[PDB]
Chain A
Amino acid sequence: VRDLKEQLEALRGESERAERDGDLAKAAELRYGRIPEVEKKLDAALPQKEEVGPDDIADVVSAWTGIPAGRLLEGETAKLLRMED
């Protein structure tokens, strides 16, 4: 998806040049077509670890003081769901 973001940047240069050349037809085709469509595509392409968040804080306050405060990280939920067994 990194190339497509750069591709989104390439589309922005394309809309720049469409408007340079008087290409109204491409102006909106990029403003309401290519650029926004690649943008929704890239929003979909977002996988999730490049900035601290409201869960690393919980991780630290769990490692320290031992009290578990998290989000039931996909392994604890299955186990908690069958306890009376």
Chain B
Amino acid sequence: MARAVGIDLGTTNSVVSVLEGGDPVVVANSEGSRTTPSIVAFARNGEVLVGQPAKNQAVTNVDRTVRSVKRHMGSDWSIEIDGKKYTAPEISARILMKLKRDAEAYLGEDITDAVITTPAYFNDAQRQATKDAGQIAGLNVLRIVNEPTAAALAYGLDKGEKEQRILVFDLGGGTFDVSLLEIGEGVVEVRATSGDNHLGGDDWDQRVVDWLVDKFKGTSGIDLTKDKMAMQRLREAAEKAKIELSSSQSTSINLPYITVDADKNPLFLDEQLTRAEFQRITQDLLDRTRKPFQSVIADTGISVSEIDHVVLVGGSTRMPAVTDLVKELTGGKEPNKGVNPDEVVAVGAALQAGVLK
């Protein structure tokens, strides 16, 4: 293999791809899901879950669960987790130690080097934070590849030698980045960047869950805010409805017994969703993506026709709401496909690794 890897450490989708002789193999975590959810749940033990284990404790260790410390990398974003305050490098280093031993398990030895990514809206303070986390977790970022750059790598978007224009829409479950990329000579510039560092497809899921309990109380009048496990369940079902309606027009969701009803009957959940209503629901979350892209456009001053590739990264760009507003704003320009958007930036960062190896 490449003696290193690449890591789309998403804001909610921490993914790591290796190179089976150059073949981008996104490694199944020891959690099974190749995507580690980029969440670090400092369980009330001193122990620290990561991934869907941590995600499950986003409601339970809500007071001790960290999400989107990605955004807070460049500081001492130092969370008082039982003992002392653990800065963003160490919260990242925890997920990195997980991924480290997942890959060591997948291997038979600890081939540990990496190319771990940053949004193009990040700054070199966040990247110094990642340098420290690498001193911590024991994996090497021999170089960082910003996430749009590793996107254009991952789809092999080596268009024109003189210069190529790669549009990149990152929507991780917890991050949004519009990026426009002038690339050449094997050397990359993300020419422009905008986005919504608060928006993600789990913000999309959060709007979903809003609606869920909205019509829950529309009929009967109970709030799953009142129930923490119900919030966990809504959140999980909502993201899996995300990856569902990244292919499905509509997904009906249902749950047995939850809380007492008005007549003291253990109430449940049962109804269709239509993805039309979904893109209606993320509509201002879709406005949270457009004028970002207008800003990156003005930053580059480029016609969407002149763009030589478009890219969808971050698993919430499996969504066709993403691709809809793409082909709307991009003049119909189809982003390149071949890797899962969560897998994309990890894959292409791994390609950079192999380019080093």
A78 adjacent to chain B (CB < 8 Å)? no
Q: Is A26 an interface residue (CB 8 A)?
A: yes
- Point out the residues of chain A lying under 8 angstroms from B257, CB to CB: 25-30, 32-33
Interface string of A21-54 (1 = CB under 8 A from B): 0111111111111000000000000000000000
Interface bits B264-282 vs A (CB < 8 Å: 1, else 0): 1111100000000000000
Chain A contact residues: over half helix, strand or loop, or mixed? helix
| Pairs across A and B, CB under 8 Å, 9 listed | A22-B233, A24-B227, A25-B258, A25-B268, A28-B256, A28-B257, A28-B266, A31-B266, A33-B266
Interface residues on chain A, size class: 10 to 19
Which residues of A come within 8 Å of B, CB atoms?
19, 22-33
Chain A residue contacts of B233, Cβ below 8 A = 22, 24-25
Interface centre among B255, B260, B266, B268 (most CB of A within 10 A): B266
- What residues on A are CB-neighbors of B259 within 8 Å? 28, 32
CA distance A27 to B227 in the complex (A): 10
> Which residue of the partner chain, among B236, B264, B266, contacts A29 with CB atoms under 8 Å?
B266
Restricting to B56-70, which residues have a CB under 8 Å from any CB of A?
Answer: 56
**Cβ–Cβ < 8 Å partners of A24 in chain B:** 227, 229-230, 232-233, 255, 258
The smallest C-beta distance from A52 to any residue of chain B, in angstroms, reads 36
Complex: chain B residue closest to A30, CB-CB: B257
Q: A19-B229, A24-B229 are in contact. Are A32 and B256 (CB under 8 A)?
A: no
Q: What is the minimal beta-carbon distance from B211 to any residue of chain A, in angstroms?
A: 18
A24's closest neighbor in chain B, by CB? B233
Residues of A within 8 A of B265 (CB): 32
Is A32 in contact with B266, judged by CB distance below 8 angstroms? Answer: yes
Of chain A, the residue at the smallest CB distance from B52 is A22
Scoring B229, B258, B259, B265 by chain A CB atoms within 10 A of each residue's CB, the highest score goes to B229
Given A22-B236, A32-B266: A27 and B260 interface contact (C-beta under 8 Å): no
| Chain B residues whose C-beta falls within 8 Å of the C-beta of A29 in the assembled complex | 256-257, 266
Q: Return the chain A residue nearest B230 by Cβ.
A: A24
Report the minimal beta-carbon distance from A10 to chain B, rounded to whole angstroms. Answer: 18
Complex: chain A residue closest to B255, CB-CB: A25
CB-CB under 8 A from A23, the residues of chain B are 229
Chain B residues with CB under 8 A of A30 = 257
Give the distance in Å from the alpha carbon of A32 to the alpha carbon of B258 in the complex: 9
Given contact pairs A24-B229, A31-B266, a sample of 19 additional A-B residue pairs in the complex whose CB atoms are under 8 Å apart = A19-B229, A22-B236, A23-B229, A24-B227, A24-B232, A25-B255, A25-B258, A26-B257, A27-B227, A27-B229, A27-B257, A27-B258, A28-B256, A28-B257, A28-B267, A29-B257, A32-B259, A33-B257, A33-B266
CB distance from A26 to the nearest CB of B (A): 7
